[PDB]
Symmetry: D2
Subunit: 116 residues, 4 copies
């Protein structure tokens, strides 16, 4: 898979399990079209969102549903979600890992981009 | 002003100056309506976006235009922008500071909510 | 004062108040000598650690006592402390702000170096 | 291995390769004794630092030599190194991953602790 999402919990020091993730792609008419979705595993990872064929050039938005995650743990967090918006594959196909580290009032995100 | 934005540059170890910031409020039909905007100052801060009277409870989106900032520095960035989406709550503290720490392929954001 | 420390709590969305901070300077024999210390204020800031006259070029270590902070909040933390080790440089800008963002199993730290 | 170190470069969006890492353990007399060392691989990971037998309870310091890393890339960075100081195995053996995300004037670090 050319797109993987990895989520960690900075309060517990653990993978963030069962986090819902929705991916969108900006359309020809400039709206956000649903592209893929899934939930993180026991390792905090979400594989198999898309294929090399389907993951064409475009502007993508990865929405990580952090509020639902925290609420299930009894925490009222600040953010509705974490959003990662980026152009993909504009210089040829790449492999993208979107990592996120979650706290109730803060998140970070970093991309690891590799070339096959 | 109940909403402040502060942006830092993790590559240069400096405030992120002249970064455009756009704030939106979610409308009843689920679209994002422009609410306020500005550019960060020499201290990386953006004050005066809104007022207590206007900043009512609701869902807000703060977009920090990071791609243009890195391009101006000659550095190839990953993200289109950094996005902070949150519900404003009256039972919460009175002042929201949205802070962001920027790198070309990473950002963090935190909320500091105080009286 | 050429050295300021600012600490934020990523769990509560607040300044980290009453956090002990110890600063050391590396001695000729490679040991760490106490240099300055204090506790963060209600704004999460620690001002007045040193003076321009005393803060000469050298290697400094700032230890932020995060474990005691989390224990006081009833939260089990990972680290003993957060540690920031750097060389102070006169050709650099005049004022160093060491900022830290704290979670129980994670921290970040950045330097904001300005005139 | 019960101790793994993973390092990412936030400027390039890549693993941080060939980063030197030194681990110390606080001694009976309260000094920092050398415990293990190594360098990160092409994946930004450092495996095989220690064994379950050797990794006893104690206070450990993981020093990631970030200044040397940045200087090799033509950057004069702020920090001498990133230091991660923690008590390990005080409630029985755990597996520890120490992750670090590096920028020239900033780093973050998070621990992922799991139970076997
Ligand atoms: O509000 C601030 C803030 O959130 C951070 C911060 C954010 C994320 C990080 O990862 C980090 O290391 C620092 O720094 C600051 C530095 C200042 O001088 C003033 C600030 O107001 C903040």
């Amino acid at each position: 898979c050319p797109l993987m999402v990895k989520v960690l919990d900075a309060v517990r020091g653990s993978p963030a399990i069962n986090v819902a993730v929705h991916v969108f792609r900006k359309a020809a008419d400039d709206t956000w079209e649903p592209f893929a979705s899934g939930k993180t595993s026991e390792s905090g990872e979400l594989h198999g969102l898309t294929t090399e064929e389907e993951f064409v050039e475009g502007i993508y938005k990865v929405e990580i549903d952090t509020k639902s995650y925290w609420k299930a743990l009894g925490i009222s967090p600040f953010h509705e979600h974490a959003e990662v918006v980026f152009t993909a594959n504009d210089s040829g196909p790449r492999r993208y890992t979107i990592a996120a580290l979650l706290s109730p009032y803060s998140y970070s995100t970093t991309a690891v981009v590799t070339n096959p």
